[PDB]
Amino acid sequence: VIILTIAGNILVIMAVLQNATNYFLMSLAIADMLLGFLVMPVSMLTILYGYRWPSKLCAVWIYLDVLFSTASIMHLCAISLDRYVAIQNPIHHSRFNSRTKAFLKIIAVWTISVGISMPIPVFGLQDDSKVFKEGSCLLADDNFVLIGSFVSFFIPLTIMVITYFLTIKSLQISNEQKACKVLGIVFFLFVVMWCPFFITNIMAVNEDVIGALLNVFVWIGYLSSAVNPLVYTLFNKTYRSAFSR
Numbered sequence: 001v002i003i004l005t006i007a008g009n010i011l012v013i014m015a016v017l018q019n020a021t022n023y024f025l026m027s028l029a030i031a032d033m034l035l036g037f038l039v040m041p042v043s044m045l046t047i048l049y050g051y052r053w054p055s056k057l058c059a060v061w062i063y064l065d066v067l068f069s070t071a072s073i074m075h076l077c078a079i080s081l082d083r084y085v086a087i088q089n090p091i092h093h094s095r096f097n098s099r100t101k102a103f104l105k106i107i108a109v110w111t112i113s114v115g116i117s118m119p120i121p122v123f124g125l126q127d128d129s130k131v132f133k134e135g136s137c138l139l140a141d142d143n144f145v146l147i148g149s150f151v152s153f154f155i156p157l158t159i160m161v162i163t164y165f166l167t168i169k170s171l172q173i174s175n176e177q178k179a180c181k182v183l184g185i186v187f188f189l190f191v192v193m194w195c196p197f198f199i200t201n202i203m204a205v206n207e208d209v210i211g212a213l214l215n216v217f218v219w220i221g222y223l224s225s226a227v228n229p230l231v232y233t234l235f236n237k238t239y240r241s242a243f244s245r
């Protein structure tokens, strides 16, 4: 999954197709390539050593994990919200797009990503038990998980549910039907690969059963960083040719 993530994103970074909307997909592919080289391979060492953490970098590793995970989720939310306005009223969307929105959009999805994960090393790096190890380097803040995973997933999820319901409502002519199938695959994969981890994360707060469930579901969430390059790009004839060359 690590090799797949890195090899999938470094093939999308070169291919950039210099559109104002395609550059935003490079900012999404940069939030996942970093996730695939800094955060993800560290967890492979933890899997090898059986949850024992080789010590002051544990709070740093969680900071990057929350940062790149929230940066990815709101990249897809911004894409989904932008894709709805481009489909509802395309005339008024083209007038107000001067290649400054795309730079203003990268600012917004990285200000909230870095603003939500800022409590981790500013209050939690001094305390070695709040955002810190139970012997295993977990995120033991029981009140930040409830509200920090609420605005990071469930608010981007209720935004995506209304955006997806409204977009399909406004898309209903084969090209419109081909697009409706692309939205379904994109929406279904984001839910099925991130939602399983977040219900288990918050329902938890038998330990052995839940400890095994959260272990596998974490890697299902990581695996979505290998797929995001493909489902958001490879539907384009140009990208398929670019990957082959």
Ligand SMILES: CCN(CC)C(=O)[C@@H]1C=C2c3cccc4[nH]cc(c34)C[C@H]2N(C)C1
Residues within 6 Å of the ligand: 061, 062, 065, 066, 069, 070, 137, 138, 139, 145, 148, 149, 152, 218, 221
């Ligand atoms: C096994 C230990 N690890 C790995 C460092 C975690 O618990 C990570 C903690 C996360 C987490 C907590 C709280 C809020 C959040 N938003 C987004 C994420 C998040 C990402 C999420 N990653 C995928 C797992």
